[PDB]
Design a protein around this ligand. Structure first.
Ligand SMILES: *[C@@H]1O[C@H](CO)[C@@H](O[C@@H]2O[C@H](CO)[C@@H](O)[C@H](O)[C@H]2NC(C)=O)[C@H](O)[C@H]1NC(C)=O
Ligand SMILES: *[C@@H]1O[C@H](CO)[C@@H](O[C@@H]2O[C@H](CO)[C@@H](O)[C@H](O)[C@H]2NC(C)=O)[C@H](O)[C@H]1NC(C)=O
Ligand SMILES: *[C@@H]1O[C@H](CO)[C@@H](O[C@@H]2O[C@H](CO)[C@@H](O)[C@H](O)[C@H]2NC(C)=O)[C@H](O)[C@H]1NC(C)=O
Ligand SMILES: *[C@@H]1O[C@H](CO)[C@@H](O[C@@H]2O[C@H](CO)[C@@H](O)[C@H](O)[C@H]2NC(C)=O)[C@H](O)[C@H]1NC(C)=O
Ligand code: NAG
Ligand code: NAG
Ligand code: NAG
Ligand code: NAG
Ligand code: NAG
Lengths: 249, 258, 195, 49
């Protein structure tokens, strides 16, 4: 429960979101696992990438094997039959045709394998990068671990390949509001420390940048710099001071 | 080729022209001083546009890089040379009909044309729709903060290694033949070089599965107290029912691969 | 289409290629980077810049106290790109070498069709007429290996060259996912300097 | 034409190699550009501060 709290603190979301809604997130995550359960079990088209590795490899061998029944410019395709039918003084010419015709069929397959094996290393190094960042930590690269703000990931094995289970965070429902980038109280700007200044129409509010949670503007909420004419978009307000009622009693 | 009249002007001693890639295109007629050109006859690839054979039984051919007049010549079926032939920018399409609507891409054809199977029912060839459009209400005084969130789980699948394979160049070229074994050797070190190249791949595959997985120092143990604050992790952790430590989601992944 | 060198057309036409680049450019302005992750939420552009000075260790008071100098400095920066691209044609060095290398591959391949390759001629029709078909098969065999090996050389050169582009297409896809749909903290990734 | 065919499957393999490149080129221009869900519209009010 605290390891989750360390990970909401990396997307600009304060700690109070998690423990105030610990039951909704738990059921949302448990239902998310069940969606992967049905999606993997129903259709077999999800494993497209790992299937094409075997089929491309199996197509290379069957091409290579079927090349052994070709004359390649000679009169036959059997090593034993050409020796019996034709004299060895002139069978060497015919068996020479079953050298270049078969040696060139092997160097073609080897060259295709060396190029194809460079693709896998470029994908094995990318998978090693994800297992070092997306599993052993939290990543701030946008659209690296799934579309959205990232939380964690889990690795799973596969036949000649690896399968990840990313866990992202996506906002759902938005609301219109009215904003002003600065606040003026005593002829001076009142830039907020962390967040923007919003108003529903009557009272201005300050809130964080990814989840609606307004607060009354206080002296702790803001830092002051400059006068009240340079900034464009200024809107007046009153910033309450917590010290004066506290010092009153 | 296809002879035609030409507007090119030769020189009064000149016989026939050529091109950049040393190809003959302009030939002067011997008797008459008229100028003739050369155009190669039409050719291209033949493609078949079909839906799933489980669903329907109707096809539509696509003759590529050809004007829609040279069709019906061919040389299959005779019926596939009519029925509202529709010209595309990538070739001549026979067996489909033009629609003024816009839909998502189903089968690529070329130059922004997609075929599908829609309802009675036939094969259509529309222009793809680049998603649904949108417009944001931008202003100098507006802001939008979301009020509720979601947690989702996607899936990313990558390959790590292929199957290690070694091929003996001695046995493959000359399999148990005294005359062939000696004649192969005088070619030199072709056989020796190939068996050293395929060893470099086979060593590299072990290194690939070492870097992706073996990044942990000590094997850890799953605690027996599974109180994880509400989260249910039993679907991904190992299940002691099988003799192996294979989990449940891994079990489906192995069966889907043939 | 002269000797079987067909060229297929690309699926994405160049008219609607600019439609994507008029959409990624129109979500960067108003929505900021929010449309990369979830749903696009409109932000004033003066406030969208203020989110981006806050990622390089610079407080918010720098921008709105100097909003007129930065606006003219950015507008003059676009004009410098306008003259630099229009004057010289040597800026597009990288995209030019792709076409020229591909063009030399075909012209090498086409000019190989006028070589005897060990035979007595280089014309398929002429060798059949002059020499008897019992022995013209030996001569036309020389115009098999001499032309088949000239094709596998070109294909192998194309497969190696096509691996370079994917290594550059995946790098460009990484920049469009980080440098456009967000702000990057990788030093010297998006130009020399704080991004 | 007949003498070429007895060489085997060299012609068939090369036409399967070049279609692997041609499919891959369409995948490249799909990944770089098509990363946006919905096409957005430029607002008419161009007051960008
Ligand atoms: C903007 O939000 C504030 C904060 O809730 C609203 O202020 C309160 O609104 C409730 C609504 O029933 C009233 O019962 C309270 O008396 C209000 N507080 C005070 C101190 O008066 C405000 O009404 C909202 N304005 C608009 C236009 O929605
Ligand atoms: C914010 O408050 C200041 C302080 O009252 C306003 O400045 C006054 O503006 C009126 C006319 O607009 C003048 O008659 C006063 O002399 C000004 N007083 C001072 C101290 O400057 C300012 O107009 C207010 N701005 C908004 C947007 O409400
Ligand atoms: C935020 O969204 C979630 C779901 O996306 C809401 O949870 C649902 O709430 C309704 C009404 O309370 C229930 O009928 C559903 O059963 C809930 N779903 C789940 C999976 O528990 C949640 O209520 C939303 N937040 C707010 C404040 O309304
Ligand atoms: C975690 O999810 C699994 C999968 O649903 C749960 O296992 C099933 O639980 C239900 C009742 O909750 C039983 O009727 C099934 O028989 C269980 N499946 C198997 C294969 O035994 C599991 O109970 C969940 N974890 C917790 C702590 O409830
Ligand atoms: C409210 O927001 C929606 C989009 O979220 C927008 O279309 C609409 O114009 C907004 N209305 C007002 C009054 O701001
Ligand atoms: C916001 O834009 C409107 C559009 O005309 C304009 O009238 C108003 O003065 C602008 N306000 C600020 C603070 O820029
Ligand atoms: C094949 O078609 C039948 C009937 O429409 C359908 O029930 C079945 O699911 C289809 N199979 C596949 C693999 O789509
Ligand atoms: C196809 O041929 C006809 C008649 O030869 C001609 O009129 C038409 O322009 C041709 N199509 C194109 C696209 O050139
Ligand atoms: C489709 O467009 C063509 C050409 O503009 C027009 O002749 C035809 O009537 C249109 N059909 C429909 C259903 O809009």
């Amino acid at each position: 429960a605290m390891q989750m709290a360390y990970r909401f603190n990396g997307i600009g979301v304060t700690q109070n979101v998690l423990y105030e809604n610990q039951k909704l997130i738990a059921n949302q995550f448990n239902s998310a696992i069940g969606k992967i359960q049905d999606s993997l079990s129903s259709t077999a088209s999800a494993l497209g990438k790992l299937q094409d590795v075997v089929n491309q490899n199996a197509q290379a061998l069957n091409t290579l094997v079927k090349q052994l029944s070709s004359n390649f410019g000679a009169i036959s395709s059997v090593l034993n039959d050409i020796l019996s039918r034709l004299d060895p003084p002139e069978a060497e010419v015919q068996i020479d045709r079953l050298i270049t015709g078969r040696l060139q069929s092997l160097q073609t397959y080897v060259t295709q394998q060396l190029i194809r094996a460079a693709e896998i290393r470029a994908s094995a190094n990318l998978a090693a990068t994800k297992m070092s960042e997306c599993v052993l930590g939290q990543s701030k690269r946008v659209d690296f671990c799934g579309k959205g703000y990232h939380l964690m990931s889990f690795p799973q094995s596969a036949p000649h390949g690896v399968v990840f289970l990313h866990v992202t965070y996506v906002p759902a429902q938005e609301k219109n509001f009215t904003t002003a980038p600065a606040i003026c109280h005593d002829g001076k700007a009142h830039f907020p420390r962390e967040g923007v200044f919003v108003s529903n129409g009557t009272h201005w509010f300050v809130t964080q940048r990814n989840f609606y949670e307004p607060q009354i503007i206080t002296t702790d909420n803001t830092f002051v710099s400059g006068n009240c004419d340079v900034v464009i978009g200024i809107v007046n307000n009153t910033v309450y001071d917590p010290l004066q009622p506290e010092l009153d009693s | 080729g296809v002879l035609t009249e030409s507007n090119k002007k030769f020189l009064p001693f000149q016989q026939f022209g050529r091109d950049i890639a040393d190809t003959t295109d302009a030939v002067r007629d011997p008797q008459t001083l008229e100028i003739l050109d050369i155009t190669p006859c039409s050719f291209g690839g033949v493609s078949v546009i079909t839906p799933g054979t489980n669903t329907s039984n109707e096809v539509a051919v696509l003759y590529q890089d050809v004007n829609c007049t040279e069709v019906f010549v061919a040389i299959w079926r005779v019926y596939s040379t009519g029925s509202n032939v529709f010209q595309t920018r990538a070739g001549c399409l026979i067996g489909a009909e033009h629609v003024n609507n816009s839909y998502e891409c189903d089968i690529p054809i070329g130059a922004g044309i997609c075929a599908s199977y829609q309802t009675s029912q036939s094969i259509i060839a529309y222009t793809m729709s680049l998603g649904a459009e949108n417009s944001v209400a931008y202003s100098n005084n507006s802001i939008a903060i979301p009020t509720n969130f979601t947690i989702s789980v996607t899936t990313e699948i990558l390959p790590v290694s292929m199957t290690k394979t070694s091929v003996d160049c001695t046995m493959y070229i000359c399999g148990d033949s005294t005359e062939c074994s000696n004649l192969l050797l005088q070619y030199g070190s072709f056989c020796t070089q190939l068996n050293r190249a395929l060893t470099g791949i086979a060593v590299e595959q072990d290194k690939n599965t070492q870097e992706v997985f073996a990044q942990v120092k000590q094997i850890y143990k799953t605690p027996p107290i599974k109180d994880f604050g509400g989260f249910n992790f039993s679907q991904i952790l190992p299940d002691p029912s099988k003799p192996s430590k294979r989990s449940f989601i891994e079990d489906l992944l192995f069966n889907k691969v043939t | 289409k002269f000797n079987g060198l067909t060229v297929l057309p690309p699926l994405l036409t160049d008219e609607m290629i600019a439609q994507y680049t008029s959409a990624l450019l129109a979500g960067t302005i108003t929505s900021g980077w929010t449309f990369g992750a979830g749903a696009a939420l409109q932000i004033p552009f003066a406030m969208q810049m203020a989110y981006r000075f806050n990622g390089i260790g610079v407080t918010q008071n720098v921008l709105y106290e100097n909003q007129k100098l930065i606006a003219n400095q950015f507008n003059s920066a676009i004009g410098k790109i306008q003259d630099s691209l229009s004057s010289t044609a040597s800026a597009l060095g990288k995209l030019q070498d792709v076409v020229n290398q591909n063009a030399q591959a075909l012209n090498t391949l086409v000019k190989q069709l006028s070589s005897n390759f060990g035979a007595i001629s280089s014309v398929l029709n002429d060798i059949l007429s002059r020499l008897d078909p019992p022995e013209a098969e030996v001569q036309i065999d020389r115009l098999i290996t001499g032309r088949l090996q000239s094709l596998q050389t070109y294909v192998t050169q194309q497969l190696i060259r096509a691996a370079e582009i994917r290594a550059s297409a995946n790098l460009a896809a990484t920049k469009m996912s980080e440098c456009v749909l967000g702000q990057s903290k990788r030093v010297d990734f998006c130009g020399k300097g704080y991004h």
